[PDB]
Write a protein that binds this ligand. Structure first.
Ligand SMILES: [Zn+2]
Lengths: 81, 71, 215, 98, 129, 97, 130, 36, 24, 210
RNA sequence: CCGGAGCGAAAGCGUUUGCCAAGAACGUUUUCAUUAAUCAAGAACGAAAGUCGGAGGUUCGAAGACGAUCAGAUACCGUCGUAGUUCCGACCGUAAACGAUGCCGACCCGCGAUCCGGCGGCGUUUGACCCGCCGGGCAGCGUUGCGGGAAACCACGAGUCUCUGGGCUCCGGGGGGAGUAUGGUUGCAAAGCUGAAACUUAAAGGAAUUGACGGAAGGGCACCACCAGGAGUG
RNA sequence: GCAAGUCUGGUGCCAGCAGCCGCGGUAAUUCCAGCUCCAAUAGCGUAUGCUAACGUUGCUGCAGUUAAAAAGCUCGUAGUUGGAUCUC
């Protein structure tokens, strides 16, 4: 949100769920922001780069948290098809 | 449920008009009764002549004598 | 008298590792220590007891009377909290509810009515809270209308920072215990309603647990 | 308030069942609502099977059994301690007691 | 029976959106639905959709972007003039900053903002925000 | 609070009308390891019953303060409670061979 | 029947001192009186009475309430046990026909350590209802 | 004596304790004492 | 019981018709 | 792992067949139907070993992403995975709850046994439902060795395998411990790991003395 | 045999066999081409009891008689027993007629059974049985229900209603007076449908919690209780 | 409720107050008065209509499992409501 003059008036921009584009509320304790490390092409060791994914509590409680991360890993070329 | 048809203005107008008579506050002000039985006949005040001096007792749990007049 | 944190979240905010309270709300981190709340908002934070409702428990020898305390706390801009505590003495019930009302302080998103000039004055959209049977609908209002609401939810809306509103409650609003919790629930959805201005892709940042892992 | 989802009987998709009569009180109780108890016991109880075995004219004669179909109404089944009251959550267990 | 196929289309979208789905299949296809889904797509509420064309009414499979809160219809489909359009915006739209009311005017099926610029009224199909 | 600040064990202050039908307000303030039975109730907690007469009547003051365990000191009793068995730490003997 | 005060104090004795206590009530009473300061003399004998009773259980096997370093070292030694050959390192592996088709879809379906086991006819894997 | 001792008794008296203002007054406590 | 109050009203308005039919 | 060096070799698939990691019981969860290859004639569901390897490395990536290894919690309530998670915690450096998970360990801050990790790893989602449900009140992710008849109520990385079975569960904890160490600077990935998979196998008290 | 099984619009429906007409589901690359959905005043059906005219009348049994029981007992219990209970023809159109939940349509969780039709698969047994799939139907469990609600509870939705609109009919407006009075109407009658008012009242009621209580069940404890006894007391 | 006296004297379920809940049973913050205080103010109280309160007449916008509530069920005309499709 802006103030029609370039002034961002939102005190904090919440994280949207990487699986359902849902706003992760400040009191959504079941929410998860899991990091998935990236490996090297030639040796496959941890270099320091990782990928961030946020899944809200509703998707996680429903049981579609592992399928969402699986599809998100295939999109970022983490796990094989 | 309700009929949301675009030509149901007659059904809605007739249904609402009939169900208003099941209202105790509406049927009291739009009938001959409750006005013919009203001694004042729809007036604010009324004059009269005192006939007796009767005292009715207060209902429970109160205990007193209410000083009334037969007018 | 000195604060000794027991959770790793309190250790970070005590060592000046977490700058603003928004980082806690950004990552949905649970605030289990009340000393973290007044660490950031302790300067301007004014509470108010809404009602002391005595509850009774029928026993073999009589009624055990306990007293609740519905305390509404807020910084009057963007943060509001509500806490309920039922103890035997009224003094310890009020002190216990202020601690719970601080732990429940949530951010408050505010928007504009039509044009956008200055600062947000009302709710961004029509949000509706629900608790028990009483529901309250927070509707945006023009710039200078003020909080058009009952005296009970008006305290929550003034302590949250909302200046203008057009509320419409339905249900047993005589129950202040459910009326206040329903109003506090309607303010919880201001930062949970996806609007077109929040359609940009989320850029993630290191969480305070990860940024200060070794510390 | 509704105490049982099955209304205390077993009738799904029907309107009327044949009412049977109880055993110890002769009360008309529906066939599905009645508390049945199939008791299969020998004609000679264990206290007299030895005396009958000694008085038996055969060498290997298995004593018969007495098949009795009992239909109890809810009033008499509880009074006879055939069934008892259970907890609000322990009422849903339909498995018979071992 | 199946009346107001546009209602069954937006109800299927609104449900599948809250369940977190990515694609929703609409059983009956109609030009009124396609004109409605195009307005929702031009404002960034739904993605692309394939009009599956069998030799019947036809089906549609719409992609969902997670940006839609609720899409519904106005069942009686009242006649909205250019003066009464402001009243419908306050009741249906959750805010004066977003949300649209899809109308049906002589210039075609469009939202309420475009009806103000073209200076024409008509009938109201529904809303989305 | 004065007993807690000056002392270790809690106390109990009951200043109201105990047996009545209109003054029947117990108003009991109990906290901090209050013993009521047994023989150690004598040398571990001392009771004080005083009276305060006012315009509306007379009120009683029942105070039961418990003293901490102080060895050979006038602060508290020099004997431990019977329901307490303190075991010393095991000897750290690294010189095994 | 002992109470919690003697039950608790008796277990802490064994956890801290194990190379000193014995199986006799009179000997355990002496060492318990020496290291532990028990106010009552009857209560002191109650603790020594239950401490000696736990010795017959500890000498028989481990207990869930007391963890001594003589029985933990035995668990730590058997936990680090490693056989000479791996139980998974077999020379002949018998697999069914369905799992062979799964390995064939993979990039390695030709393995010498595989015996295609033919499942028996009929599907009677469920339990009879009733 | 009495056959039913657990009874009302007098006209202005009852078996249980009742106040004239439910705690409030100048001779008894029990009124609104919340914020003190 | 509510079924007996209905039975009394049935027997009450039944004799009301008797004392009303006899006067005509 | 989609590269060429992150593909399982012949010695890895032989251990899965020897232990029984592909056998997945008779029941099937609708959330695990993508990890099952085909149901057998005796009702047994065969778990795809290739998809298990992909979820294993995906699980190992999240573990290495945790800077402090102690922030990883490895909980196993059943006896079948008690010593397996203890050797896993020692091989990596994470915490563990091998006994009984006390309710309120993650929520009751004033409790003595209070530990707030950054990543929870349970053995069986059904048997360890209490640590999973309790971890939902906090922002603790979950990596679970999920069988076919295992609910994914609070599972973030479901590893399809035969969680029940001594040789099966012990191998999975050994496989994950190796991949986490291989992704770090500890194992060269060319020489086989010195630790044998029999160190993670739970032994009954009847077979220990022999 | 007989089931939380089937059928029927409901009420209701259980020996064999035959006859008459009808029906759901399934199958179809058959046909018609919007003929549809819900429906005021109308109409069919409609448990038990009751009414009218015949036949019949074993058991049971209103009323009634008598024998008990009790302070009384025209009740509960027992012995006899009328109308009824069964059939035929014609009325009454009433039930806790209940899933206390109208009908049609769309979207919406999972799993295992069950009845019917169809499809496929590997054997066993002379169609039966075993493993899946599809449509329809009576239901169940897990949902600690993505949701709903005052709870209880609800996936035959009571879900997709303040983010309030698929179509339509009936119907509720604090509790009593009262389904009463009167009028109309129907009926042989009993009664059905329609149906107020004067007046009276601050509550009535729903779900759940704690306690108390039970001539409710289970598990335990003392001679201020008892069994077996000793002293008595009156 | 609803801004404003644990004040003083009198009365003792009497007289009276009270829209409602209630108050008065010899120590009444509620009656009769003194003092004090509060609210609006040249105004203000009361009685009866009417409107908003009332989403308790609900077109917007109510309900009908258990709180008042879906006809016992089905058929059936008026009435209401009706698939897709023709230049994009
Ligand atoms: Zn019986």
């Amino acid at each position: 949100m802006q103030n029609d003059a370039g002034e961002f008036v939102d005190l904090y921009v919440p994280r949207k769920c990487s699986a359902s584009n849902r706003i992760i509320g400040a009191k959504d304790h079941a929410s998860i922001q899991i990091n998935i490390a990236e490996v090297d092409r030639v040796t496959g060791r941890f270099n320091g780069q990782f990928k961030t994914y946020a899944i809200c509590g509703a998707i996680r409680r429903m049981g579609e948290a592992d399928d969402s991360l699986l599809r998100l890993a295939k999109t970022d070329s983490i796990v094989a098809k | 449920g309700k009929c949301r048809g675009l030509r149901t203005a007659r059904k809605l107008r007739n249904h609402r008009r009939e169900q208003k008579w099941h209202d105790k506050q509406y049927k009291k002000a739009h009938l001959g009764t409750a006005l013919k039985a009203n001694p004042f006949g729809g007036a604010s005040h009324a004059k009269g002549i005192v006939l007796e001096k009767v005292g009715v007792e207060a209902k429970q749990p109160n205990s007193a004598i209410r000083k009334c007049v037969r007018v | 008298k000195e604060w000794v944190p027991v959770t790793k979240l309190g250790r970070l905010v005590k060592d000046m590792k977490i700058k603003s309270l928004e980082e806690i709300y950004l990552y949905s981190l649970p605030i289990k220590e009340s000393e973290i709340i007044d660490f950031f908002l302790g300067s301007a934070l004014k509470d108010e007891v809404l009602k002391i409702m005595p509850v009774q428990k029928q026993t073999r020898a009589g009624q055990r009377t306990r007293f609740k305390a519905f305390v509404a706390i807020g910084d009057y801009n963007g943060h509001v909290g509500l806490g309920v505590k039922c103890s035997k003495e009224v003094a310890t019930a009020i002190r216990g509810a202020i601690i719970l009302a601080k732990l429940s302080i949530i951010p408050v998103r505010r928007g504009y009515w039509g044009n956008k000039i200055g600062k947000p004055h009302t709710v961004p959209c029509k949000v509706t809270g629900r608790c028990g049977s009483v529901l309250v609908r927070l509707i945006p209002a023009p710039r200078g209308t003020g909080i058009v609401s009952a005296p009970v939810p008006k305290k929550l809306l003034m302590m949250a920072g909302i200046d203008d509103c057009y509320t419409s409650a339905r249900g047993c609003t005589a129950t202040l215990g459910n009326f206040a919790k329903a109003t506090f629930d309607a303010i919880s959805k201001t930062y949970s309603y996806l609007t077109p201005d929040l359609w940009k892709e989320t850029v993630f940042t290191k969480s305070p647990y990860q940024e200060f892992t070794d510390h | 308030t509704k105490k049982r989802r099955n209304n205390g009987r077993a009738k799904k998709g029907r309107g009327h069942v044949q009412p049977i009569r109880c055993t110890n009180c002769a009360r008309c109780v529906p066939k599905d609502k009645a508390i049945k108890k199939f008791v299969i016991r020998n004609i000679v109880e264990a206290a007299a099977v030895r005396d009958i075995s000694e008085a038996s004219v055969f060498d290997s004669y298995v004593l018969p059994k007495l098949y009795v179909k009992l239909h109890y109404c809810v009033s008499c089944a509880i009074h006879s301690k055939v069934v008892r009251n259970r907890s609000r959550e322990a009422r849903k267990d339909r498995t018979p007691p071992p | 029976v199946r009346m107001n196929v546009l209602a069954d289309a937006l109800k299927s979208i609104n449900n599948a959106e809250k369940r977190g789905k990515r694609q929703v299949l609409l059983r009956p296809c109609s030009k009124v639905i396609v004109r409605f889904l195009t307005v929702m797509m031009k404002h960034g509420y739904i993605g692309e959709f394939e009009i599956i064309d069998d030799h019947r009414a036809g089906k549609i499979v719409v992609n969902l972007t997670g940006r839609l809160n609720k899409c519904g219809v106005i069942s009686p489909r009242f006649d909205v003039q250019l003066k009464d359009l402001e009243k419908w915006q306050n009741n249906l739209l959750p805010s004066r900053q977003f949300g649209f009311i899809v109308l049906t005017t002589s210039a075609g099926i469009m939202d309420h903002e475009e009806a103000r610029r073209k200076h024409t009224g008509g009938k109201i199909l529904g809303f989305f925000f | 609070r004065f007993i807690m600040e000056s002392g270790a064990k809690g106390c109990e202050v009951v200043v109201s009308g105990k047996l009545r039908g209109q003054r029947a307000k117990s108003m009991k303030f109990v906290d901090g390891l209050m013993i009521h039975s047994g023989d150690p109730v004598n040398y571990y907690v001392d009771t004080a019953v005083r009276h305060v007469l006012l315009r509306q009547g007379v009120l009683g003051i029942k105070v039961k303060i418990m003293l901490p365990w102080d060895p050979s000191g006038k602060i508290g009793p020099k004997k431990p409670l019977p329901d307490h068995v303190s075991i010393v730490e095991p000897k750290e003997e690294v010189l095994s061979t | 029947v002992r109470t919690k005060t003697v039950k608790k104090a008796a277990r802490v004795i064994i956890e801290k001192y194990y190379t000193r206590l014995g199986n006799d009530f009179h000997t355990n009473k002496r060492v318990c009186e020496e290291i532990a300061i028990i106010p009552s003399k009857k209560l002191r004998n109650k603790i020594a009475g239950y401490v000696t009773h736990l010795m017959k259980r500890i000498q028989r096997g481990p207990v869930r309430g007391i963890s001594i370093k003589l029985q933990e070292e035995e668990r730590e030694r058997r936990d680090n046990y490693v056989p000479e050959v791996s139980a998974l390192d077999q020379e002949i592996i018998e697999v069914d026909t369905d799992t062979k088709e799964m390995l064939k879809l993979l990039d390695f379906g030709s393995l010498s350590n595989l015996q295609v086991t033919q499942p028996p006819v009929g599907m009677n894997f469920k339990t009879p209802r009733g | 004596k009495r056959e039913f001792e657990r009874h009302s008794g007098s006209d202005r008296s009852s078996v249980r304790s009742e106040e004239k203002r439910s705690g409030s007054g100048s001779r008894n406590w029990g009124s609104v004492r919340d914020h003190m | 019981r509510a079924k007996w109050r209905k039975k009394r009203m049935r027997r009450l308005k039944r004799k009301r018709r008797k004392m009303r039919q006899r006067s005509k | 792992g989609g590269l060429d060096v992150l593909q399982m070799k012949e010695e890895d698939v032989l251990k899965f067949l020897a232990a029984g990691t592909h056998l997945g019981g008779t029941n099937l969860d609708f959330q695990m139907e993508q990890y099952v290859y085909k149901r057998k004639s005796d009702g047994v569901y065969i778990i795809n070993l290739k998809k298990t390897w992909e979820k294993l490395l995906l699980a190992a990536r999240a573990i290495v992403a945790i800077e402090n290894p102690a922030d990883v919690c490895v909980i196993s309530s059943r006896n079948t995975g008690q010593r397996a998670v203890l050797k896993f915690a020692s091989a990596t450096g994470s915490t563990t709850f091998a006994g009984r998970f006390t309710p309120g360990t993650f929520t009751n801050q004033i409790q003595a046994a209070f530990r707030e990790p950054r990543l929870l790893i349970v053995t069986d989602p059904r048997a360890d439902h209490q640590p999973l449900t309790e971890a939902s009140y906090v922002n603790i992710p979950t990596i679970a060795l999920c069988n076919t008849d295992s609910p994914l109520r609070y599972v973030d990385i479901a590893i399809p395998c035969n969680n029940k079975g001594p040789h099966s569960v012990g191998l999975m904890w050994w496989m994950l411990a190796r991949e986490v160490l291989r992704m770090r600077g500890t194992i060269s990935r060319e020489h086989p790991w010195e630790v044998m998979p029999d160190l993670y196998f739970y032994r009954d008290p009847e077979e220990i003395e022999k």
